[PDB]
Amino acid sequence: GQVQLVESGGGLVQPGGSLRLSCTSSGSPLEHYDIIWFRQAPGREREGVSSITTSGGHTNYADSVKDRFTISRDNAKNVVYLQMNSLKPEDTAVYYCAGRVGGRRNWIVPLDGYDNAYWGQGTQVTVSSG
Amino acid sequence: GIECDSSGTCINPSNWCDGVSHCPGGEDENRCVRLYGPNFILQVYSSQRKSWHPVCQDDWNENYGRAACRDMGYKNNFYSSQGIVDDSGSTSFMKLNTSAGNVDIYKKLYHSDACSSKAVVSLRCIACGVNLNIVGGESALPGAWPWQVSLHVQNVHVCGGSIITPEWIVTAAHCVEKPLNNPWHWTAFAGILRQSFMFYGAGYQVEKVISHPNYDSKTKNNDIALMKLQKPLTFNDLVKPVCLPNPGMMLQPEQLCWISGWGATEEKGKTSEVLNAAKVLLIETQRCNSRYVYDNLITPAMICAGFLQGNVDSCQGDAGGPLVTSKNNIWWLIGDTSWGSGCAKAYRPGVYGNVMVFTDWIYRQMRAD
Ligand SMILES: *[C@@H]1O[C@H](CO)[C@@H](O)[C@H](O)[C@H]1NC(C)=O
Ligand SMILES: [Ca+2]
Incomplete structure (x- = not known):
């Protein structure tokens, strides 16, 4: 069946706070897919922020989020995670997962790979005071 | 596209010599x-x-x-x-x-x-398919797999490939996805068993990278590409081509094949220092498409090989490399390593581009050069 991605874990936090996003699938197990987290805020362009191969052996981060964000996955639990620490107002956006059938090459998954991928519905992340 | 006659009708190059007359004068099948x-x-x-x-x-x-x-x-x-x-x-x-x-x-x-x-x-048309007579395998001897190459970017082994002429290498399209579509990024290493002996000056510059025009990175359908070298390789005991498969190979449902490569010898592992190789069996696509295996992700442009129990398989590092079989005392290139969930897990065999269905495109590319 065609994979159906579903993101969760978003919400409202203050500057400095943390969120843990996660993505699961129906239709086809997530273990078959390379995964890119990308984000988009209204008025701005889409931005790939992190990616991971099916095996977890190559991860990749946008300069804007490195050291604050950590991607990981658990294939037995059918889930991919994005730990987001030290959040900033500029991180406000809808966060989406994008998946492709994962290849066996020894290289990172490019952050702009959401342009030809299965996509989830997105989860809103809002970082502001009050 | 290609022009049929003077009237200006164009047809897709894939419609050239495919059995159906798409030209009113039949030029495409003549x-x-x-x-x-x-x-x-x-x-x-x-x-x-x-x-x-x-x-x-x-x-x-x-x-x-x-x-x-x-x-x-x-x-x-x-x-x-x-x-x-x-x-x-x-x-x-x-x-x-x-x-x-x-x-x-x-x-x-x-x-x-x-x-x-x-x-x-x-x-x-070419001397090919002769040799000296990865999870779960063993280290290869010099000349055992003389068509095997290692493809590097930024001084790192990224993919494998298979020599088919002194100038042409078969590999996977997902190896050369942008930003790695530029031929100047790549070096090919032939005839060398150890990654540590693959250094600047020891390999071959790449002139052209051609991905299959119907490659779909989302599904990995049609996962094949050609690399053209800037200079012809010199063939010897250690460097020789594999034969492209012909119509009518009549392979067995579970034909015995071999895979070779520097792929990790264990999921999440690093590139093997030495070339390894292993036996795998073909797995019928209907069985590969079972809800317990890949559940209808295997297209006609893919084939499965390995063991549904696991244990022996290609892995990260093996992408683009050869899946070969011996028949009539000739080694033939049946697949190129493409994708596969994990490495050597039960019910997760290796998936390969189905080179038989790509041979006509390959010929067209070699002829157009
Ligand atoms: C062979 O070619 C000659 C010269 O055009 C022609 O006269 C003859 O009919 C041809 N024979 C056959 C069997 O095509
Ligand atoms: Ca035709």
């Missing part, structure tokens, strides 16, 4: 040649009869064989041509009309119920 089966029977297509027919050995010679090899895209390579007993099953043949002169083969050939020399042309 000049079609192929090598059939494991004994390389030269066959010509008849658009009228809509069928393929072997060429009589009658009055054939080496110049005709070289002409045919060029038309197939092999440029100046030519290995051998001899008459043999037809093992293709055919029942009508193409015979040279000597009384007509200087026309191309297609105008000179005519249908005949028999060959006067009682043999048909067997034609090999």
Whole structure:
């Protein structure tokens, strides 16, 4: 069946706070897919922020989020995670997962790979005071 | 696209020599040649009869064989041509009309119920498929897999590939996805078993990278690409080509094959220092598409190989490398390593590009160069 991605874990936090996003699938197990987290805020362009191969052996981060964000996955639990620490107002956006059938090459998954991928519905992340 | 006649009708190059007359004058099916089966029977297509027919050995010679090899895209390579007993099953043949002169083969050939020399042309355009006689495998000897290459970017092994001519390498399209579509990023290393001996100056520069035009990175459908080297390789005991598969290989449902590569020897592992190789069996696509295996992700452009129990498999690092089988004492390139969930897990065998369905495209690319 065609994979159906579903993101969760978003919400409202203050500057400095943390969120843990996660993505699961129906239709086809997530273990078959390379995964890119990308984000988009209204008025701005889409931005790939992190990616991971099916095996977890190559991860990749946008300069804007490195050291604050950590991607990981658990294939037995059918889930991919994005730990987001030290959040900033500029991180406000809808966060989406994008998946492709994962290849066996020894290289990172490019952050702009959401342009030809299965996509989830997105989860809103809002970082502001009050 | 390709133009049919003077009226300006264009057709997709994939519609050229595919059995269906997409041109009103039949031009796209009027000049079609192929090598059939494991004994390389030269066959010509008849658009009228809509069928393929072997060429009589009658009055054939080496110049005709070289002409045919060029038309197939092999440029100046030519290995051998001899008459043999037809093992293709055919029942009508193409015979040279000597009384007509200087026309191309297609105008000179005519249908005949028999060959006067009682043999048909067997034609090999390149010496290939000879060698010295990854999870769960063992280290390869020099010359065991002489078509195997290691493809590097930024001083790192990224993919494997298979030599098919002194200039052309088969690999996977997902290896060369942007930003790695630029040929100047790549170095190919041939004839070397150890990654530590693959350093700047030891490999070969790449001139061209061509991905399959119907490659879909989302599904990995049509996961094949060609690399053209800036200089021809010198062949020897350690560096030689694998043969491209012919129509009519008649492989067994679980044909015994081999994979080779520097892929991790364990999921999430690092590139192997040394070349390894292992045996795998083909797995029928209907079984591979089971809800317990890949659940309808295996397309006609893919084949599965390994063991549904796992234990032996390709892995990260092996992408683009060869899946080969021995038949008629020739090694043939049946797949290129493409994708696979985890490494060597039960019910997760390796998936390979199905090279048989790509051979016509490969010929077109070699011929267009
Ligand atoms: C062979 O070619 C000659 C010269 O055109 C022609 O007269 C003859 O009909 C041809 N024979 C066959 C069997 O095609
Ligand atoms: Ca056609």
